Scaffold this motif. Structure first.
Motif, short mmCIF file in Angstrom:
data_model
loop_
_atom_site.label_atom_id
_atom_site.label_comp_id
_atom_site.label_asym_id
_atom_site.label_seq_id
_atom_site.Cartn_x
_atom_site.Cartn_y
_atom_site.Cartn_z
N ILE A 1 0.86 -1.19 0.00
CA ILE A 1 0.00 0.00 0.00
C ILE A 1 0.89 1.23 0.00
N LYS A 2 0.71 2.09 -1.00
CA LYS A 2 1.59 3.24 -1.18
C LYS A 2 0.93 4.57 -0.78
N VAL A 3 -0.32 4.77 -1.21
CA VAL A 3 -1.05 6.01 -0.91
C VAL A 3 -2.49 5.73 -0.49
N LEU A 4 -2.93 6.44 0.54
CA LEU A 4 -4.33 6.49 0.92
C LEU A 4 -4.71 7.95 1.11
N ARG A 5 -5.84 8.33 0.53
CA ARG A 5 -6.38 9.67 0.70
C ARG A 5 -7.87 9.63 0.46
N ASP A 6 -8.61 10.32 1.33
CA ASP A 6 -10.05 10.49 1.17
C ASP A 6 -10.32 11.67 0.22
N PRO A 7 -11.11 11.44 -0.84
CA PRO A 7 -11.41 12.52 -1.79
C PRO A 7 -12.47 13.48 -1.23
N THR A 8 -12.08 14.25 -0.22
CA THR A 8 -12.95 15.25 0.40
C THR A 8 -12.97 16.50 -0.50
N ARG A 9 -13.17 17.69 0.08
CA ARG A 9 -13.30 18.91 -0.73
C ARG A 9 -12.29 18.91 -1.87
N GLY A 10 -12.78 19.10 -3.10
CA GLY A 10 -11.94 19.02 -4.30
C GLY A 10 -12.14 17.75 -5.12
N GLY A 11 -12.73 16.73 -4.50
CA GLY A 11 -13.10 15.50 -5.19
C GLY A 11 -11.95 14.57 -5.51
N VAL A 12 -12.22 13.56 -6.34
CA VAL A 12 -11.22 12.59 -6.77
C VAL A 12 -10.15 13.25 -7.64
N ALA A 13 -10.59 14.16 -8.50
CA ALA A 13 -9.70 14.92 -9.37
C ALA A 13 -8.55 15.53 -8.58
N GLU A 14 -8.86 16.16 -7.46
CA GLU A 14 -7.86 16.87 -6.69
C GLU A 14 -6.87 15.90 -6.04
N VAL A 15 -7.39 14.78 -5.55
CA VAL A 15 -6.56 13.73 -4.98
C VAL A 15 -5.53 13.26 -6.00
N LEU A 16 -5.98 12.99 -7.23
CA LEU A 16 -5.10 12.50 -8.28
C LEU A 16 -4.02 13.52 -8.63
N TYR A 17 -4.40 14.80 -8.62
CA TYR A 17 -3.45 15.88 -8.84
C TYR A 17 -2.47 16.05 -7.67
N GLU A 18 -2.93 15.75 -6.46
CA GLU A 18 -2.06 15.79 -5.28
C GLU A 18 -1.06 14.63 -5.26
N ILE A 19 -1.49 13.45 -5.70
CA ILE A 19 -0.57 12.33 -5.86
C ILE A 19 0.45 12.63 -6.96
N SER A 20 -0.05 13.16 -8.07
CA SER A 20 0.77 13.53 -9.21
C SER A 20 1.89 14.52 -8.85
N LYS A 21 1.54 15.62 -8.20
CA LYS A 21 2.50 16.66 -7.85
C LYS A 21 3.54 16.16 -6.85
N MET A 22 3.08 15.35 -5.89
CA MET A 22 3.92 14.95 -4.75
C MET A 22 4.73 13.67 -4.95
N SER A 23 4.25 12.76 -5.79
CA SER A 23 5.04 11.56 -6.15
C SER A 23 5.89 11.79 -7.41
N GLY A 24 5.58 12.86 -8.14
CA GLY A 24 6.29 13.19 -9.38
C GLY A 24 5.92 12.23 -10.50
N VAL A 25 4.63 11.94 -10.62
CA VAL A 25 4.13 10.92 -11.54
C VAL A 25 2.89 11.43 -12.27
N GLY A 26 2.48 10.70 -13.31
CA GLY A 26 1.19 10.96 -13.96
C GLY A 26 0.20 9.87 -13.60
N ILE A 27 -1.09 10.16 -13.74
CA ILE A 27 -2.12 9.16 -13.46
C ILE A 27 -3.15 9.12 -14.59
N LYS A 28 -3.29 7.94 -15.18
CA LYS A 28 -4.34 7.70 -16.17
C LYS A 28 -5.49 6.96 -15.50
#
Ligand SMILES: [Fe+3]
Ligand SMILES: [Mg+2]
Ligand SMILES: [Mg+2]
Lengths: 305, 370, 305
Positions: free
Chosen positions: C194-221
């Motif tokens: 298990i690498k990442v857990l995050r609840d998609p609260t204010r900002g939705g799933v979109a924001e979570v994916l962008y937060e993983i993207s910015k902080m892990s230095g990766v893209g998400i499809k």
């Protein structure tokens, strides 16, 4: 009649809550506190809401005989709150955490519609770690113990009153907002001889003594002539017929100690920058009463705020 | 669309470039632009920057144009819109940033073409662009040089309920335009599904996913929807083009009103009333369309004269995607020319968002050297 | 709007803040998070501000792969706020804590003048204990990892908006508010995978994916036909021009796992009461881009809210 704290105590009823401590003690060595800050005005002589939000929680996190280390900061902000005021608040928070040797590690910011909050509220939580032989609790006072105060009484309460209600005095009154974890660290040299530590905030010194009385199941006698108070606060209260024992403090701690260690506790405080005006103020009684002695030996009960 | 056979030939500038600039362009019909020497190296058409293959293609070409023209950018110029990919790529680059307003960019892209460097009357008509007041722009008249702009005229702000949904389902655009005068458009509004309508009217009232728009594109969409040209489109501007094609030959127009407060404003709903009255009387779409086109031409003309009177400025720039409309451009150039104006529009780059990056480049350049 | 959390970042710049986690990891062992709750109405289909206040913090405290234990609760209450309304909120809190196996150990209660707060704001802070071999962070994602979501997307966001603005749909929408600590615990059987857990609260799933993207230095499809959505939410969004990925969730978690262990992670989610709707929704790529594949394979970039 805020019997909200009664509703709170019923629903979250447990060992930690029933105790009514400044902080919960978890795992035996770490401490946890939370406080909200709703002061108006946000900027007042001697401080602001930011410095207050940090210091208060740093203080609460130490009152258990602990070094505070980590803090959370939650901000609830009104739509269109001036950002330059916010930069000032945040800066004051940064400075206080730095002085306290503490770090804000988590947080939250929420923006609400215009009119859903008067400008800005802040909540802070704190984590501290207990010193080696610390055992500080509002339940720990025994008859024979000595009561000390770290400095003058009623500064903050009168300062925000003066600013908020536009009351002009012959001398301007400044708030005493300060982090006391440094002073507490030097007191905790005394280990188990330090029995109770509490900052006299909402309800002042009077309320603390009553809380010590209730929870320790003891009484407390204080001495009028021994109570430290700035002349500006003294006459401000004397003009309005107020008892400074009911006004809030934000840079003070009430200390209960073993009889033999009281002299040492005073000197530990007096040699610290926030403890120069410290005094031995009273004694823990057998009576389950809170009493104050005037000059010559005229006893009367301290009234509750 | 400027691509094969035109690109990678640059745009020639009179004054030499002060410092090398990369303009990232916008969203729709994207091109980028690199400055060096007497040349602005605008890219060939890249497309809408909203997908992976478009972005990759965009990246590769920036790098390819650098090698092919030995350009090394010293500052990035982006659109003020915070949600464009072009803006994000400009954000990620470790360079200083100059943000440029969309429609300011439009006007400047035409100015670059004619080597203009003075305050001009800039008429920028399109579908969307992020304005400095946070709202959607697209029906603007600006007093601008290449450095800054002053916003002198626009259409009255109308709600656009559902944003991109209203651009596809243009009957929603009509609803926002007619919102505060619903009862007058009874026949059209009655044919809206009762459940959806209640949601739409609430969307507007409580500002849920609803931008306020000043937009020539949206104005046209509302007309097209009201007079039964089209309820839904398959691409942005579809209703716009169809409305231009079916138009008849006429000189008739509608009555409009120019209210002056902080700046010159025209209420489009006031024009829609008459449009709807014509449609209810059974008038031909072709006749209505013709009249509506002339109305736009006439109020833009009258607005030019008023601004000339108060400022003294005699040069008019016509840009923005709306001016892809042949009638709207031809007629406006003539009406203004016959009245003493010096009128300029795009030719080397498009008046649409394809021209944005050239305008971004020259504005950012005036900023730097000035 | 979000210009405020920016000021927060710069003045409280440290190693913990810059990590931008759901909760700080302290002493290499315990988690700490805080969060404020300002939702209107206070009572909505499928929950209330009380349940929300506890569940949100329980969840965030769990997000580093940890068991939540102790909470704090702070109340900012408007003068004249019905006490009967408050009992009900507090009851929901005590029941939620009971479910999540958690205790409220410290708190605060503030009453403010009428018109200074809109009814009641609640802040909760929480600490939890890390599991053995638990290494979960927003930085931990890598190309090849699989992305999964606990259940239906957008339920809470639409539910509350629908109740507040009185929006009438074919099917009423109910909030998903739930404590996920239990699902997290059963998920932590695969520690390190298990690498990442995050609840998609204010900002939705979109924001979570962008937060993983910015902080892990990766893209998400992600892939559209694999995204679990309730029909009533799909429709609600279709009527309003709203992307369900932008909507708040309060009973869901986004999970990022090692390719090989992805299948097992889905199965154990399906066997829990709060993960029966769970699905594999995409994978981590080295593209530094957040994309969605619609039906018939079109790689649109996911819009940031
Ligand atoms: Fe445009
Ligand atoms: Mg305290
Ligand atoms: Mg979280």
């Amino acid at each position: 009649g805020a019997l909200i704290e009664e509703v709170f105590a019923d629903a979250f009823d447990n060992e930690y809550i029933r105790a009514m401590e400044d902080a919960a003690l978890l795992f035996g060595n770490i401490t946890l506190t939370t406080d909200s800050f709703t002061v108006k005005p946000l900027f007042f002589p001697g401080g602001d809401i930011g410095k207050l939000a940090v210091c208060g929680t740093v203080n609460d996190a130490s009152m258990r005989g602990a070094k505070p280390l980590f803090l959370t900061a939650a901000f609830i902000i009104e739509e269109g709150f001036p950002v330059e005021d916010l930069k000032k608040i945040v800066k004051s928070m940064a400075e206080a955490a730095k002085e306290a040797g503490v770090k804000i590690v988590a947080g939250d910011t929420k923006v609400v519609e215009k009119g859903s909050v008067d400008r800005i509220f802040i909540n802070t939580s704190g984590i501290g770690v207990l010193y080696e032989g610390a055992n500080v609790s509002i339940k720990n006072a025994k008859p024979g113990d000595i009561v000390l105060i770290s400095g003058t009484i009623g500064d903050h309460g009168m300062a925000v009153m003066s600013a908020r209600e536009e009351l002009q005095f012959d001398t301007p009154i400044f708030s005493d907002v300060a982090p006391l974890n440094g002073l507490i660290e030097k007191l905790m040299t005394l280990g188990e001889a330090i029995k109770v530590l509490r900052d006299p905030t909402r309800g002042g010194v009077a309320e603390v003594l009553y809380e010590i009385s209730k929870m320790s199941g003891v009484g407390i006698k204080i001495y009028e002539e021994k109570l430290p108070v700035k002349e500006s606060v003294k006459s401000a209260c004397e003009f309005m017929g107020i008892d400074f024992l009911h006004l809030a403090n934000e840079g003070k701690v009430v200390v209960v100690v073993e009889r033999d260690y009281a002299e040492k506790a005073l000197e530990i405080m007096k040699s610290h920058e926030y403890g120069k005006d410290a005094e031995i103020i009273g004694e823990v009684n057998d009576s389950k009463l809170v009493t104050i002695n005037t000059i010559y030996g005229t006893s009367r009960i301290v009234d509750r705020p | 669309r400027r691509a094969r056979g035109y690109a990678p030939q640059p745009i020639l500038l009179k004054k030499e470039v002060k410092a090398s600039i990369l303009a990232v362009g916008g969203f729709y019909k994207n091109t980028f632009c690199m400055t060096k020497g007497h040349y602005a190296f605008i890219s060939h058409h890249i497309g809408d920057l909203d997908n992976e293959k478009a972005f990759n293609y965009y990246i590769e070409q920036i790098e390819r144009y650098k090698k092919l023209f030995r350009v090394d950018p010293e500052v990035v110029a982006h659109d003020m819109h915070k949600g464009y990919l072009s803006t994000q790529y400009a954000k990620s680059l470790d360079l200083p940033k100059i943000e440029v307003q969309h429609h300011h960019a439009h006007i400047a892209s035409c100015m670059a073409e004619h080597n203009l460097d003075e305050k001009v009357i800039g008429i920028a008509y399109d579908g969307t662009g992020y304005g400095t007041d946070g709202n959607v722009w697209g029906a603007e008249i600006l007093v601008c040089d290449l450095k800054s702009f002053e916003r002198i005229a626009h259409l009255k702000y109308k709600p656009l309920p559902g944003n991109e949904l209203a651009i596809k389902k243009i009957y929603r655009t009509a609803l926002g335009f007619i919102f505060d005068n619903i009862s007058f458009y009874k026949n059209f509004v009655e044919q809206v599904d009762s459940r959806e309508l209640d949601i739409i009217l609430k969307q507007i009232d409580r500002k849920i996913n609803t931008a306020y728009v000043s937009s020539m594109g949206r104005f046209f969409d509302a007309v097209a929807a009201l007079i039964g040209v089209r309820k839904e489109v398959l691409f942005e501007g579809q209703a716009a083009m169809e409305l231009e094609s079916l138009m008849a030959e006429s000189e008739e127009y509608y009555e409009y009103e120019i209210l002056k407060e902080d700046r010159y404003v025209i209420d489009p709903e006031l024009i829609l009333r008459q449009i709807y009255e014509d449609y209810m009387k059974g008038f031909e779409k072709s006749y209505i369309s013709a009249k509506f086109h002339n109305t736009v031409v006439n109020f833009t003309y009258d607005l030019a004269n008023l601004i000339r009177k108060e400022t003294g400025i005699n040069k008019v720039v016509l840009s923005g995607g709306s001016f892809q409309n042949r009638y709207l451009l031809r007629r406006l150039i003539e009406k203004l020319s016959l009245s003493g104006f010096e009128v300029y529009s795009n030719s080397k780059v498009p008046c649409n968002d394809g021209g944005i990056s050239l305008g971004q480049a020259v504005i950012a350049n005036k900023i730097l050297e000035g």
